[PDB]
Write an enzyme that holds these catalytic residues in place. Structure first.
Site, mmCIF file in Angstrom:
data_model
loop_
_atom_site.group_PDB
_atom_site.id
_atom_site.type_symbol
_atom_site.label_atom_id
_atom_site.label_comp_id
_atom_site.label_asym_id
_atom_site.label_seq_id
_atom_site.Cartn_x
_atom_site.Cartn_y
_atom_site.Cartn_z
ATOM 1 N N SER A 1 53.121 78.182 75.993
ATOM 2 C CA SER A 1 54.354 77.559 76.476
ATOM 3 C C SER A 1 54.928 78.258 77.710
ATOM 4 C CB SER A 1 55.399 77.548 75.359
ATOM 5 O OG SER A 1 56.718 77.430 75.870
ATOM 6 N N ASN A 2 55.217 77.462 78.733
ATOM 7 C CA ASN A 2 55.786 77.962 79.989
ATOM 8 C C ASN A 2 57.260 78.314 79.826
ATOM 9 O OD1 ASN A 2 53.355 77.439 81.759
ATOM 10 N ND2 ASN A 2 53.799 75.322 81.132
#
Ligand SMILES: Cc1ncc(COP(=O)(O)O)c(CNC2(C(=O)O)CC2)c1O
Ligand SMILES: Cc1ncc(COP(=O)(O)O)c(CNC2(C(=O)O)CC2)c1O
Lengths: 328, 322
Positions: free
Chosen positions: A78-79
């Site tokens: 996840s960014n």
């Protein structure tokens, strides 16, 4: 005028100046239409992305509460988690991440490299779960136990996609309209549509600043049926928080994400290879590669309103390239 | 301004106060964010490519040719720029550490090379880089391309003009907001060091510039920086009298191998500031900066500017080890 209630919300500054909005002359040549790109992948905190805009608002709110810990959730790659952890370190806040493996991979780069690598550099406390079956409840369970240690926590939902978080993209729309003045008359805007705050902030902003522009969300995890009510609720809640109405219809294409969230596909990887080889621009396997593949098929199949200019919002994602190589 | 230049950056890159790092170190530390240039994860080389590739176009070249390590940041940036402009890119690569680690071999910057459709040519060693590039430039021309050669790190006098430009930004950005005492940059192929040397001598003469080496001794490196410094000054009709300062204690056991202080510097900046350095260049330069504080090695104990020259995609290649 119409978006002036935006200044009522406290916000931090992580970006500064407007991110570049650039013409893509070589991609435009190949596709047979004018393509422009909004470079939110170049926001200056730890490899950038669409979430820094949202965090400016959310973290500003966290500090108002006297909170000293940020707690959020997402995939291992996840960014959002990565940008959240970066911002936390920068401010001396603690960060706790509820992570999941959404694809069941045992590939070492997915498990250890890319976004997951950087989290250890920011001293993120990592909480693994089988699955984010109920992220909001699961985050509250985590915040309770973290609160017990004496921490002053602040729960950031998946993707920072609440109405307050989405204010970052209402603001992006103000930038975008300003940059497009007398330079280009846009017809369409394309962005990946996941946790939905980016789509929804842009939806509200563009309705009020650029009425005749068609906003297309390309889903990355969900069908139009599942996704549309998620974008609509943020849009509506966002509108109300700014004392405006929003009557725009929401547009979504869901043909580009199969086999599912976080799984690369052929059209996605070919879009990544196209942007890299033609423009020296780096997309990603999860979000922007799939969004861009939607833009491309959209031109191919004449799914847009006309033949006029299209703005692609680069929402980031590149560090995941290193986690997905060589495979899985 | 008498040199043709392409626009790859635009607005001046941020210059920021690092308050948590300043607090910890007991010194005012500022950062120049040249890692945040907008082309394919950025770096210090794009400043040089503005002049180098402009030159390439003036000559009507259809191919860019350069040399580097498998994980070279400069190769990656050259390829990105090549792609963006519709130029071919030929890269001559070596493995400077003899590793068989898969991530070093195929991930990080080398992964991006394939995305940019880079023509890869492997060599045993870059023993004479200037000569071997010229041999390659002949071969590629024989196939019917028009090549332009860019030296290692793009560190000619022409490329280094990018860092005289940077000094201007620095000078404007630093006054009046601070009273700077020292600047720190990693010193490799010498383009970044020498360009800043000429610019800062003229723009901020009272500041000490320190280059932390990343591949050579002070004895091997000082003539390199001095020569470029003089070449740059000549082409701008300026005189460069200032000393070059180099610290070489921070790169053992060699180029492209991470060391403990360097990795502790990577950790320190990420954890205190949310800033990402790299195991080859900036991590080792930051470790140099930190040790200078403990050893009182700077000229005085005033504000220090660190020049973040980029490098971060290397983190993904160097993990989990080499
Ligand atoms: C690069 C990139 N592009 C587009 C999107 C979709 O944005 P929204 O979540 O705002 O709809 C994400 C989200 N990513 C999530 C994450 O956990 O990182 C929020 C799901 C993204 O990272
Ligand atoms: C991130 C980063 N930081 C500092 C430096 C050193 O700069 P100079 O080469 O201008 O001295 C490099 C160099 N790049 C090398 C490469 O091949 O990538 C030797 C050029 C760099 O990439």
């Amino acid at each position: 005028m119409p978006l002036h209630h935006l200044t009522r919300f406290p916000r931090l500054e992580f970006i500064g100046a407007p991110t570049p909005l650039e013409y893509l002359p070589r991609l435009s040549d190949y596709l047979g239409r004018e393509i422009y790109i909004k470079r939110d992948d170049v926001t200056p905190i730890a490899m950038g992305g669409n979430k820094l805009r949202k965090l400016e608002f959310l973290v500003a709110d966290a500090l108002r509460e006297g909170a000293d810990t940020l707690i959020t959730a997402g995939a291992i790659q996840s960014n959002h988690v990565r940008q959240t952890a970066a911002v936390a370190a920068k401010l001396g806040l603690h960060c706790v991440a509820l992570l999941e493996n959404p694809i069941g991979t045992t590939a070492e780069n997915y498990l250890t490299n890319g976004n997951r690598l950087l989290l250890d550099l920011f001293n993120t406390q990592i909480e693994m779960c089988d699955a984010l079956t109920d992220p909001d409840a699961q985050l509250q369970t985590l915040a309770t136990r973290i609160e017990a240690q004496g921490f002053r926590p602040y729960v950031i939902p998946v993707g920072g996609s609440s109405a307050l978080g989405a204010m970052g993209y209402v603001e992006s729309a103000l930038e975008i309209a300003q940059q497009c003045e007398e330079v280009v008359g846009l017809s369409s805007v394309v962005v990946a549509s996941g946790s939905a705050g980016t789509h929804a902030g842009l939806a509200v902003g563009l309705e009020h600043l650029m009425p005749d522009v068609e906003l297309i969300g390309v889903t990355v995890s969900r069908s139009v049926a599942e996704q549309k009510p998620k974008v609509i609720a943020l849009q509506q809640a966002i509108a109300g928080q700014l004392a405006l109405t929003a009557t725009a219809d929401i547009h979504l294409w869901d043909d580009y994400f199969a086999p599912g969230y976080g799984v690369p596909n052929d059209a996605g990887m070919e879009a990544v290879k196209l942007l890299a080889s033609l423009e020296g621009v780096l997309l990603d396997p999860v979000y922007t590669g799939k969004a861009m593949a939607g833009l491309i098929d959209g031109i191919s199949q004449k799914r847009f309103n006309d033949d006029g200019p299209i703005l692609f919002i680069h929402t980031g994602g590149a560090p995941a390239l290193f986690a997905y190589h060589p495979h899985v």
